[PDB]
Amino acid sequence: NFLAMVDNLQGDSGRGYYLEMLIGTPPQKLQILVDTGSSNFAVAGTPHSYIDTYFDTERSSTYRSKGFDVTVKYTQGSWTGFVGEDLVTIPKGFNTSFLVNIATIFESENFFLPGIKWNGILGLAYATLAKPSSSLETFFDSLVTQANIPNVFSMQMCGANGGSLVLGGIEPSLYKGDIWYTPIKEEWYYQIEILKLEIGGQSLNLDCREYNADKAIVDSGTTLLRLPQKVFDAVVEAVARASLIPEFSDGFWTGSQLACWTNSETPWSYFPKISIYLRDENSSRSFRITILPQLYIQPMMGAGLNYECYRFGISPSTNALVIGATVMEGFYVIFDRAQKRVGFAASPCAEIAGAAVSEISGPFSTEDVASNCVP
């Protein structure tokens, strides 16, 4: 029943989209980060400054220790915990309970951060990333096996107020127009092949291997669009070339002052569109996902004011090109593990004041790009 899963996420890009879960007997309720960039299901198992509650194993009659521990490191942050299994109910999705592996965290560094509302994480990537090894079955593989659902899930983020995680397929009411699919290049992270980036209709002129040199991945657990240093610099250079920033004048005399705007005025009309080309499942064809300034020049303030301050939602990476929440907020994203593909459709909830903040278009030809851009 996919309609019941509509709006089962809360949160925002900045600190995470999370799913409520009931764990153990009697049920303990937790708030769980949705992360397509890792493969472990782990919950706080002891108090922490930045969480309200944790999972207490001694209060669950169905919990079983598996007899070993585990440590997981992310690009930033890490934790160590014990490994067992227990019954989980997802109230907004599956009213039957299923048995899953669970890591109960007792130590962490730079993981539970101030401002979060989640106390656990749902790693939705492939078994090859799971710790201590790929034989520790993932949450979603247990689910597929036990609820006998299709090996597919899909995500819509409505923060451009929550979103939806549809486990087992696609929900038609969550998109408009066509789904475009790009092949999964390597089943670990959700690695896809990027052919080209275009800023205000001008392609960057980098070898396409630059976009993938490490890997290009789709990751709901990352807030920003994260670009390898060379790619980042080429982007911001193109953005400076295509933007039309106001000149300094009365009341505007430093660059910092560009951040905040009054009187319903916004910075968006001054900035170019940003497009990512992906190979289609038909190798000779590509499609383009496009974000408008509305998605990468991001409003910051709490409610109740009559000015707004914005931040740039693109940052450099050392290694990976990470399609994080900055971009995912523009699209309904389909993780079609059964057919080794990732799908994108424009989100209806990705609208500000009636207007679309993202676009999808194709096909384009791949005739002038290498047959493989992943080195």
């Epitope: 400076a240 920033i245 660059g255």
Partner: antibody
Framework: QVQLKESGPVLVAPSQSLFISCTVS????????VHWVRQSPGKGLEWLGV???????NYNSAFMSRLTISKDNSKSQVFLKMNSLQTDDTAIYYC??????????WGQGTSVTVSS | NIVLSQSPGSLAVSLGQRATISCRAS??????????IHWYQQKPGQPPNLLIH???NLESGVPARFSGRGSGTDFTLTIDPVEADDAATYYC?????????FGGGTKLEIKR
């Protein structure tokens, strides 16, 4: 053709006051800000402040205690007045046209020496 | 104050070759992905003159031999190929925060 011309006292005694004018042509002060910058061997290039089209002034805080910039749109002139002169105020003083998010046309500069 | 530190203090480059000079800011100069820092050339007996606006935008009428790169705190100005007329001191200047400030300059010596 844009032009800026500083006129100042070539020599001024310490603790006395520095007054420099900037006469501009080829653009209007009703439309463009004018900045004051100085250059010395001891301190290099230092931005002193600016007067924008609408008459608003913003200053380098290190100098705000003793610097006043003003203008008279009808005379196409911008002015700089600095008090409590110290010998390291010896510098070349430029007026400079505002342009986008920086500065484009500079005057030739006027040499100011602070000495008794 | 945001401090700008330029290196090297002096560089000697042969005619026809590439010169690359660096500017380092004490704090990021970026807002909205734009770097509020600019490059100026000062020839002897002249005021400085803007070459590169917002880190990488070449000023109209400046030869294409001049180029600017960078983001955050690290910027470079590249002149390639260097010509005799390029003998001058180059300055970076930021205005992401007040006061606007200038780097200490880099003198390019043409190595004839």
């Amino acid at each position: 053709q844009v032009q800026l011309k500083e006129s100042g006292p070539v020599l001024v005694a310490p603790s006395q006051s520095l007054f420099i004018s900037c006469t501009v042509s080829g653009f209007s002060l009703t439309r463009y800000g004018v900045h004051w910058v100085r250059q010395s061997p001891g301190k290099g290039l230092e931005w002193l402040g600016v007067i924008w089209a609408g008459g608003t002034t913003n200053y380098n805080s290190a100098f705000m205690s003793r610097l006043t910039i003003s203008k008279d749109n009808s005379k196409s002139q911008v002015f700089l007045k600095m008090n409590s002169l110290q010998t390291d105020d010896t510098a070349i003083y430029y007026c400079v046209k505002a342009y986008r998010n920086a500065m484009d046309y500079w005057g030739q500069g006027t040499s100011v020496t602070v000495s008794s | 104050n945001i401090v700008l530190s330029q290196s090297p203090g002096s560089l000697a480059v042969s005619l026809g070759q590439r010169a690359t000079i660096s500017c380092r800011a004490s704090k990021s100069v970026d807002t909205y992905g734009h770097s509020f820092i600019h490059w100026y050339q000062q020839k002897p007996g002249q005021p400085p003159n803007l070459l590169i606006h917002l880190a990488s935008n070449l000023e109209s009428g400046v030869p294409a031999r001049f180029s600017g790169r960078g983001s955050g705190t690290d910027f470079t100005l590249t002149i390639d190929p260097v010509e005799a007329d390029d003998a001058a001191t180059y300055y970076c200047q930021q205005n992401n925060e007040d006061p606007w400030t200038f780097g200490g300059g880099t003198k390019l010596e043409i190595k004839r």
